[PDB]
């Protein structure tokens with residue numbers, strides 16, 4: 001199965017990849033694509049000819065249409081990804097921006113106790129040097145996930161509860177960047193055996209400029 005979510009599905013949408021083009025696009029992987037179109041896989045975008053790799057993040061254009069980009073991050077070595085897409089010049093104007101995660105949930109199991117910490121990074125209008133970073137604390141007995149990540153401008157924190165059977169987590173979120181606080185929502189999933197990684201999104205209806213994708217490894 002494939003688990004994922006996207007903050008705005010008007011233009012892009014996520015799920016299992018659907019396009020087979022020898023040597024570039026492969027079906028059956030974690031993927032993204034035009035709303036109304038077919039999904040391609042991140043595995044083929046990462047390290048491809050349109051990929052621009054900076055500080056652990058992939059930024060890829062499209063062969064097909066200029067002036068829109070995906071910045072995304074792989075969780076460990078799993079087929080699990082989080083990032084954003086936008087239209088515009090690049091690093092510059094983030095029009096119609098949307099944040100997402102999607103992963104293959106094959107083999108995912110969730111502990112029933114006790115505690116673990118995750119290295120987390122986040123994506124919000126990424127331009128090379130501004131990835132978010134920090135730690136999440138999971139308590140598998142209490143079924144809680146909480147933590148925060150930040151860059152120099154923005155801080156996002158999550159407070160979520162864990163559904164161990166589906167490996168989902170769901171709760172609130174808070175953004176600070178900068179001086180002012182905005183309350184929002186958090187959602188995502190654990191991925192991999194023993195919840196080896198996680199990915200999710202933090203969204204803020206009152207200011208979508210704050211919406212942030214995040215993920216990392218235990």
Ligand code: HEB
Nearest residue numbers: 019021024033034037038040048050060061062063064065
């Ligand atoms: C980057 C790099 C790249 C490259 C090289 C490519 C190359 C290619 N490709 Fe691609 N794609 C892509 C990137 C890409 N691509 C993307 C990103 C997508 C999604 C959408 C957009 O545009 O964004 C796709 C998508 C896609 C699709 C789907 C569409 C719809 O909407 O439905 C198809 C069919 C294809 C094909 C193809 C081909 C045939 C080729 C060659 C030959 N593609």
